[PDB]
């Protein structure tokens, strides 16, 4: 059944892009995620309660897609059976130009982001398209507010320490 997000809702995942960029996702429910970026262009950025379109595309392969307040588009592939992760991120020109002003707990700064989104140049878009190694998987149940509750810099040095 393609409409059964059963095996994916509650998923907490750590994974490293072929470019070295390190990222972490928590699938909060059938339309919501939390995430926390640990390194790369926008390292330390993190985000609770991002509306996402979440679907099943294979027995155990799921897709998540969403749009940011910054103008960024994301579409991710998590293959749980084969342990394969694929991410495409379309960033606006100004994020590439100035990544450091997207770096924050976004929830405190959503009108700031909308501001940058209409000033710095939208275009041309940077497509960053990349495979990642899933470094950790876990299930944490639905609506769990405490999976992603601080910045990555606040975590043990270590993280994971499970």
Author numbering: 5 to 166
In the authors' words:
Ferulic acid decarboxylase (FADase) catalyzes the non-oxidative decarboxylation of ferulic acid to produce 4-vinylguaiacol. To understand the detailed mechanism of action of FADase from Enterobacter sp. Px6-4, we cloned and expressed the FADase gene in E. coli BL21 (DE3) and solved the crystal structures of FADase and FADase in complex with a substrate analog sodium ferulate. The cylinder-shaped monomer of FADase had an overall dimension of 25×25×45 Å and is composed of nine β-strands, two α-helices and two η-helices. The FADase molecule could be divided into three independent components: the core, a helical bottom, and a C terminal extension.
The crystal structures were determined to 2.4 Å and 2.1 Å resolutions respectively for the pure FADase and FADase complexed with sodium ferulate. There were two molecules in one asymmetric unit with a Matthews coefficient of 2.6 at 46% solvent content. The result was consistent with the dimerization state of FADase, which was first observed in gel-filtration chromatography and supported further by crosslinking with ethylene glycolbis. The results also suggested that the biologically active form for FADase was a homodimer. The core was formed by anti-parallel β1 to β9, which together form an open-ended β-barrel. The helical bottom, composed of α1, α2 and η1, η2, was located at the bottom of the core β-barrel. The catalytic center was located between the core β-barrel and the helical bottom and was surrounded by α2, β8, β9, and the hair-pins between β1/2 and β3/4. The C terminal extension, which contained a long coil with η2 in the middle, was located behind β9. Comparison of the crystal structures of pure FADase and FADase in complex with sodium ferulate revealed that an active hydrophobic pocket was formed when FADase crystals were soaked in a solution containing sodium ferulate. In the closed form, the two hair-pins moved towards β9 by about 5 Å to seal the pocket and shield the substrate away from the catalytic center.
